[model samples]
Target chain A: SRLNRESVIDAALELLNETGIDGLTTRKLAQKLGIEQPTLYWHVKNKRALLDALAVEILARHHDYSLPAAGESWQSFLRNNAMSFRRALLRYRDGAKVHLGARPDEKQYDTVETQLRFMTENGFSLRDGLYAISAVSHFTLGAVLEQQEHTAALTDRPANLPPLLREALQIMDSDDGEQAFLHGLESLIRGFEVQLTALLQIV
Target chain B: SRLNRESVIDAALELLNETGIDGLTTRKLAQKLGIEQPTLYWHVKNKRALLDALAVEILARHHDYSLPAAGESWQSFLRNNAMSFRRALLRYRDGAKVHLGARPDEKQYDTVETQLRFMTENGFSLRDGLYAISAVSHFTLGAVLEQQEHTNLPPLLREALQIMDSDDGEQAFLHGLESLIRGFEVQLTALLQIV
Candidate 1:
């Protein structure tokens, strides 16, 4: 039987885990699946297409987790969503970089639409809702990228770094990645709350 | 006279602008400088070292801009710093990526020290100050990365994107980035007040 899109993505993800984003190539993927490069192309037009599909796959898994309940506050809902997105990205090697570069396909739209609707229904103007979501989403991605990169660079840290940098590194080392993430997330949520309140006052 | 670190970095930065981060290679850099890769290594050590130097160079130029005056609010100080960093990154292709990969050399300590001092003197604990600085720095880098990347997208799909996706990249970045900083500022201020 000929390989399908699912199989292509499955193999691509496997390759991603074994070899980082830089090392993942169509030739290597085709070799892993015991197929020709041409056959692989039938499923994914190019490396970008494959990576995009893999990103959607990663995100779809996030949707499988339980979302916020009906009575949950919007803050709690967004916090949960951001946490879920971060966890999903952390699962694969270089996942944040991959997700950042991925072109969100239709499957990703459902999540975006859900977020936009929740924000609007809760009294956020569409523009404000967009800003809030972008802020949280980008913050999460950026924070995770730093965390992941730092983790990889831990061994390479110079022994005689400057005192201030030493202090900053100590603080960074004191907490697991999650604490810093939560610290930033809470701050972003508070900022969103303040903005929403101000907007509501005008309305 | 032999090639020096300054000249090596200058060439690398120019090459970075002409050919993006990926396109930048030690081989090409050596060719551009009319020196062998080994000769270049005497100055930069390796590709990673070269990139790190380049990142620091970009950051050093940012420090050349005027800093917040002594009486400036911590918010204004950080806001200005963030904007300067963003502008510096935007000056080169894949600048955010370059900055993110950059290892903070000794040259970057001056800027770091100033910010830390600004926060601590303003009632923030050293720890909270570090977190605040990180949140703003990461947010700026992340926002610029997205903005830079989006600019490279094809024009045809621009219209089909969501409002958030289609909004002017700069405005989207500035608004969201400011919101995140404000959020951190409120929380840090409240925490400081409580303590």
Candidate 2:
């Protein structure tokens, strides 16, 4: 019954689902909660703060598999992390957009720390570790965003387009975007693997 | 000058540069162009259309070097495409956000065709070619977005981020992204060999 941060975020998430990101607003959110705009502001200072909270909520709702178990290869750890992250994004409409816009707060820091430690321990330089993590994180976000867009109504392709382009679109239609995502993921990890080998060789 | 589509987009771009995406409004765009909002609508239908035009403008502004030359390897072609794309997005504030929000148009299709042809011609199956192109395109977009965010950090917070300072963010981006592309190249080669 009491309006607090959690209640505000819960309502915002529902509103996000109903209206999508573009349609969401503080005015509408307060109206949904049957409260004044200022009251919602008491919990979240502004729209950015509310979106940040929603982004964190999205992350917290899903299990973070950043921590690798004993005998788990770093590759598996990275892959699992990416898969879980994408899964969380897919759970909400326009989730990748929200996550991309949200500021990285403390919880995000801890996740990053875990990932960075895993990469560094696996023989990547500190710089390389950051790049590897960033590459994977960006790849996952970008891939999911594209996949989400694919599900949306894309503009009709012109019938007179080149055959190669047509064939590529056909292939895109035949395979759900997941196979392409996994394919890209493997390549990213293999890239990191190559870097690790080169690093180890130098030492 | 008459308020045609080009003038309208030019004004919208100026507004975007002045205020960023959120600050950009069709009202403000109309005001900037010295016209009524309805007149603005005559040229561009709505905010989404305006933004879509801006995205296309951003892409068109950049030179698409994805086209391969004699003796140019697929790796180099992809690398050039990614690099050119990132350069285009970096040319504006919040460029990646604008780009991600924009709809795919004919120019995008043309770019995709060139890349698909390059991959398929080299060795990849049509399926693998799609994956390779998508991976590189996504990676570049994602990487540039991160790089843009890095530059926008408050001055007081710069010292706190070691990763941001070790080397220029550009080099880190270039190296890591190249590594990922290189990995895809190996996979592409292997897939072709197997086929």
Candidate 3:
């Protein structure tokens, strides 16, 4: 009697953290919601459709900082928005995988337009702004995708490896991947900054 | 009567082009090779093992320019190496997914060690060189991941959405990606130029 689309989506995401993408299924979801498969099917046609909803909901729920602060600069906003996006993607098991290649939801239209306009207002041409944003999206997606799939154990590293490779692996293993993520983030942001500067000069 | 690990792997890759990672199975593989499951099991223990080998083989087969060419500038090598990696990952079905988070094969040890050393030889501290290489790797992997799964498109104003459109966005993506790469080169040079 209480089931609804929003509630179904909510339970689905909560279950996603526990089961991961592959393990989550209509049967499992139906069981989790204390309903039959038919009832669940009424809400989502299949796992693929369910995933599309989860992709949009995950962002809406946790990607809170996608837009600029009232007085924020473009540089800071881009950095913060990327961080927020990474956080949202990390919130659930296989979150990045669910979001990757998922269609941009129509509900996100208002937010997405604002993001593009923010860039243009800050002096980016529409084309370049989209490129900068896309580049950031690709980089973040790449980082999160690897991070989610990471299964390396230091113990498995061979003892006979060269000292430099050994040391590098040690460093990589120690950091939670944040060090590398930040370094790459800086490179991307600085690169955008350079483009923004050159473009601003022409205009 | 000529079945061996190498031949099995070759056949498996040929099949992978037809069936993506998920569609692949031990049963299907056995059928493709015209052998029983027991015979195939003698070589590869499971799909997991098969994929690990595929990851290594894909790189070995296609990621040929991983090393810096003699007399190649660091900047040029980094650029070319990234392009080569992208090409290699795109060569197979779901190739990037196969490589991502899969074990780094011991076979890769020789090539990777030299890649790290190449940076130090060119004056990057071990740490910075790794960062630069890692950034390139992450960026390339991310690009391939999206490219493999791409299924969306856009409109102008709507028109502006050509960003997500097919073909049209490819040029600008490369353009923006180049800036990021250029930005990385600058970061590397600037840090050491001051040293």
Give the interface RMSD values of the models in order.
4.6, 4.6, 3.2
Evaluate all candidate structures by whole-model CA lDDT and list the values in order.
0.74, 0.75, 0.80
Ten residues in sequence with the least summed lDDT for candidate 2 chain A: A150-159
- lDDT tens readout by residue for model 2, A129-193: 77777788788888777666554424322225667777766766676567888888888888878
Better of 1 and 2 by TM-score: 2
Model 1 chain B weakest 10-residue run by lDDT: B151-160
lDDT string, candidate 2, B143-176, tens digits: 7766655544332223325556665356666776
Using alpha carbons, what is the TM-score of model 1?
0.87
The alpha-carbon deviation from the true structure for residue B127 of candidate 2, after best TM-score superposition, in angstroms, is 1.1
Query: What's the ranking of the predictions by DockQ, best on top?
Result: 3, 2, 1
CA lDDT for candidate 2 = 0.75
DockQ (CA atoms), all models: 0.40, 0.42, 0.52
**Each prediction's TM-score versus the true structure:** 0.87, 0.89, 0.91
| Sort by TM-score, top down from the best | 3, 2, 1
- Shift of residue B193 alpha carbon in model 3, Å: 9.9
Off by over 4 Å in 3: A152-159, A200-203, B151-157, B160-170, B192-195
Clashing pairs for predicted structure model 3, backbone only: B155-B158, B155-B159, B156-B159, B156-B160, B157-B160
Scored against the true structure, residue A66 in model 3 reaches a CA lDDT of: 77
Model 2 is docked with a DockQ of 0.42
